[PDB]
Design a protein around this ligand. Structure first.
Ligand SMILES: [Mg+2]
Ligand SMILES: [Mg+2]
Ligand SMILES: [Mg+2]
Ligand SMILES: [Mg+2]
Ligand SMILES: [Mg+2]
Ligand SMILES: [Mg+2]
Ligand SMILES: [Mg+2]
Ligand SMILES: [Mg+2]
Ligand SMILES: [Mg+2]
Ligand SMILES: [Mg+2]
Ligand SMILES: [Mg+2]
Ligand SMILES: [Mg+2]
Ligand SMILES: [Mg+2]
Ligand SMILES: [Mg+2]
Ligand SMILES: [Mg+2]
Ligand SMILES: [Mg+2]
Ligand SMILES: [Mg+2]
Ligand SMILES: [Mg+2]
Ligand SMILES: [Mg+2]
Ligand SMILES: [Mg+2]
Ligand SMILES: [Mg+2]
Ligand SMILES: [Mg+2]
Ligand SMILES: [Mg+2]
Ligand SMILES: [Mg+2]
Ligand SMILES: [Mg+2]
Ligand SMILES: [Mg+2]
Ligand SMILES: [Mg+2]
Ligand SMILES: [Mg+2]
Ligand SMILES: [Mg+2]
Ligand SMILES: [Mg+2]
Ligand SMILES: [Mg+2]
Ligand SMILES: [Mg+2]
Ligand SMILES: [Mg+2]
Ligand SMILES: [Mg+2]
Ligand SMILES: [Mg+2]
Ligand SMILES: [Zn+2]
Lengths: 97, 49, 104, 65, 69
RNA sequence: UGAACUAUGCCUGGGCAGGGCGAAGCCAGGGGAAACUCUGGUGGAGGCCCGCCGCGGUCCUGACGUGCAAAUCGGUCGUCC
RNA sequence: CGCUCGACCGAAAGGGAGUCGGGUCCAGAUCCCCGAGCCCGGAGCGGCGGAGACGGGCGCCGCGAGGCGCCCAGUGCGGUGACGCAAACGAACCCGGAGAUGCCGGCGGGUGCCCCGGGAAAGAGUUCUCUUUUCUUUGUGAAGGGCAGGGCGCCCUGGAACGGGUUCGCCCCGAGAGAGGGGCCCGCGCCCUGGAAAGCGCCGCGCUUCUGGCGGCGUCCGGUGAGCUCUCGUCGGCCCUUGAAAAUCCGGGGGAGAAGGUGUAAAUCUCGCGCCGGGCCGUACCCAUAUCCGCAGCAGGUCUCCAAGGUGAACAGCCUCUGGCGUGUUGGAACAAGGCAGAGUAAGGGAAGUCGGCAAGUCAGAUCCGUAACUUCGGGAUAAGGAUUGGCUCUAAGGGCU
RNA sequence: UAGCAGCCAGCUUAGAACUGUCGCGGACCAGGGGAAUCCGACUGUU
């Protein structure tokens, strides 16, 4: 239902920024087979200070966020610099190697 | 095989202890007269039956 | 898929080298040697083909450790004769002993 | 396999076994006979057909009718 | 292993002459008392929580207890 | 002195994909005045058929022929409840 | 007290009571360590508990709960029944059961494996474009208790033709079906004790021969299948083939005997538990294109178990994952003749080659059509002779459950 | 009451359109056939 993405370490070192990574999710989240408008108002994404929260009424498997997070790192040529790890439940942190 | 009798296992134990090389001090004791054991057997070349 | 092996020296599929697959607590599938299936007793009449009832079906020497009530029934010939052939032995014994009174 | 479910890759030139090997005729008869007799036993239970009409349709179904 | 269901029967088996030790396993939903005997390991599954301490102190003296955590 | 090879017999164990033709028995529907017939389905018989492992060893008179081998190798081939 | 008694040897695949889970080594392991059991043997006290043990009939003390005397019981009990209860005396002798029965075929129950669905969780892979994607991991021992499931010519009531029940096939019924209600057996399936503490998966911290340790979270929800094996049942088929013995164990018949006289005794098929013991021998490794045999690291020979994904009828052939390996007693550089092999290919002709169609060439799967002479009527027969076959988008028919 | 609604589940068969160079058991797997004569009946064995 409620999942978060903790990316405080990469934005503190000045590699990425939560402002661009948030906009990447709005255009690549597939809802009901489509990626536009997030299927309406069912899937709402909120962006805090270096912490993005995704909530929805459909199951919305959390490992889909890890699928798009790694898809975001490879797109920015830093796939070999960060490691998407689930520190706690309903969470996803980005750490170094 | 893995299933041995006590008599066969006792027979293989003696042939295993006879296959030891000649002690080094025996060579100096005999003045290199007995240099190597003339009854050394190999498990591939000589079979004991 | 794993290919498991035997656990004893006997490497043939004999009548006593029978196994079954069991899943261990270590998330493995190993062979587990089972005992041969027992047979319930038959009737002493030699007529009824079905086995006896109320009696365990185990190996012969297993019957040494079982209790007596697990090896017979509370009837007259229980454990050695079926109920249908007991009631026929009662009627046959009574009716034959009655014809031997009429002759006198 | 998802395409073979729609009939693709299963034409005449994609078969190398006898029709009785691809689908056993003895098992198609076993399926159908378990479907009809199960239907006849439900109509007799629900009193849609009596025991006299059930036995007639049972023998008629045992024959290829 | 045998499973005891009554609390009176557990204290009756825990006071045997062959009672080696009693192990207390605190699970998430219940708490088990595993008394070790000569042949079997009797286990009393107590689903209640406050009834566990009322039975932990009810154990006879001289029996070694081991709290498994 | 030998049946550790092989020949035959005995005791006790093990093993032999997938397919094909498809016999008795049975069900149903038609023909008959009876004798009894016809169609479909079912059934799964056999020192039966194609055929893998197995077990054999036809042909090439192939390879090899001081060989891998004091009898073997390849394709092909016989049989495989 | 003894006829079946004629010593004894003879199976590391026959018979044969009882051990499984986790961990550990440079090499050991169902044997060691930890945990959980089990079997056999042993007991005048065999150490306790329970069973055997249920009390009645006459008078009084008595307006009472109970207490006084005599006498008589009591080697268990329930169900119409199949049979069930923790036990529930019993010799000689007899009878029976299990040990202990072939091959083949059909079907059904259960595991294992495979497959499908979670737009499931934890890591990893791919991202130039697309991919809520791809890959890996998602667990429970023996023994006991309970319950699904399967089987039963097992019992009671009752009574059948308008015969009915029923299988893929059969088979079943007045010597009693169908239906209703029960009993027993097998349960290796599921829940629980074991048992999560452990085992795997992931994450974090401490540490670099005590260090080689401590913590966190997870170990999930379902589906079916002409799927493949194993196994337990069940119904058949075949034989001028009938498809082992014995140790050992049990039940019954039998009522010889033993037990005490009013609360116990004899006896207890542990009947709930406790106590002691289990000696001797084998145990490493190879098991075969280098640990066996063939003079050898010999292209030979040598008995078995386990066995995945795709194509396909297939345990065929070709490709891939787990696992294994360096091409099988050597490397490098050339591509002459002549060989062996690739069953290499070929203009026009098509057996003129040759002892001879030797050699290899055509044909080949499957579907739909069509198949003579002859015959022992079974066959011949895949006779012969034709057509169709990819890919893609649809349509139609064949099910289950409420 | 010439049965309907909801839900679930696979695997096969038949027909049709379109389409590529008339190619489609595309590799692999995989019977040449017919008319007669001699001998042995056949399977098996050496
Ligand atoms: Mg040798
Ligand atoms: Mg087998
Ligand atoms: Mg048929
Ligand atoms: Mg045999
Ligand atoms: Mg033929
Ligand atoms: Mg062959
Ligand atoms: Mg061969
Ligand atoms: Mg020969
Ligand atoms: Mg040859
Ligand atoms: Mg030659
Ligand atoms: Mg030469
Ligand atoms: Mg002997
Ligand atoms: Mg044996
Ligand atoms: Mg080892
Ligand atoms: Mg004992
Ligand atoms: Mg009493
Ligand atoms: Mg009493
Ligand atoms: Mg007493
Ligand atoms: Mg036997
Ligand atoms: Mg036998
Ligand atoms: Mg069978
Ligand atoms: Mg009945
Ligand atoms: Mg008796
Ligand atoms: Mg070993
Ligand atoms: Mg070599
Ligand atoms: Mg040349
Ligand atoms: Mg050539
Ligand atoms: Mg030419
Ligand atoms: Mg010429
Ligand atoms: Mg010529
Ligand atoms: Mg030829
Ligand atoms: Mg012909
Ligand atoms: Mg003639
Ligand atoms: Mg001639
Ligand atoms: Mg002949
Ligand atoms: Zn009888």
């Amino acid at each position: 239902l409620k999942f978060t993405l903790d990316c405080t370490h990469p934005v503190e070192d000045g590699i990425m920024d939560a402002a661009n990574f948030e906009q990447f999710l709005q255009e690549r989240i597939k809802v009901n087979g489509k990626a536009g408008n997030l299927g309406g108002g069912v899937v709402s994404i909120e962006r805090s200070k270096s912490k993005i929260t995704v909530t929805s009424e459909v199951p919305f498997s959390k490992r889909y966020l890890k699928y798009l997070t790694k898809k975001y790192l490879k797109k920015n040529n830093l796939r070999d610099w960060l490691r998407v790890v689930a520190n706690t439940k309903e969470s996803y942190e980005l750490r170094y190697f | 095989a893995s299933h041995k009798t006590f008599r066969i296992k006792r027979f293989l134990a003696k042939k295993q202890k006879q296959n030891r090389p000649i002690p080094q001090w025996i060579r100096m004791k005999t003045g290199n007269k007995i240099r190597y054991n003339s009854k050394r057997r190999h498990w591939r070349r000589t079979k004991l039956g | 898929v794993q290919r498991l092996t035997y656990r004893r020296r006997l490497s043939y599929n004999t009548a006593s080298n029978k196994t079954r697959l069991s899943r261990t607590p270590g998330n493995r599938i190993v062979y587990l040697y089972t005992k041969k299936t027992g047979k319930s007793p038959k009737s002493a009449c030699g007529i009824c083909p079905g086995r006896l009832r109320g009696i365990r079906a185990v190996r012969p020497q297993v019957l040494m450790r079982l209790s007596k009530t697990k090896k017979h029934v509370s009837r007259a010939y229980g454990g050695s004769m079926c109920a249908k052939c007991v009631r026929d032995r009662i009627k046959r014994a009574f009716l034959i002993e009655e014809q031997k009174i009429v002759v006198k | 396999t998802l395409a073979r479910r729609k009939g693709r890759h299963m034409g005449v030139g994609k078969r190398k076994g006898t029709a009785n090997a691809r689908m056993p005729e003895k098992l198609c008869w076993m399926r159908r006979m378990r479907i009809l007799r199960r239907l006849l036993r439900r109509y007799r239970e629900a009193k849609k057909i009596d025991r006299h009409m059930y036995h007639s349709l049972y023998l008629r179904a045992k024959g290829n009718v | 292993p045998r499973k005891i269901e009554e609390i009176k029967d557990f204290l009756l088996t825990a006071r045997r002459k062959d009672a080696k030790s009693v192990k207390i396993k605190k699970n998430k939903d219940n708490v088990k008392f595993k008394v070790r005997c000569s042949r079997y390991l009797y286990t009393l599954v107590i689903t209640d929580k406050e009834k566990a301490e009322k039975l932990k102190q009810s154990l006879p003296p001289g029996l070694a207890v081991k709290e498994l955590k």
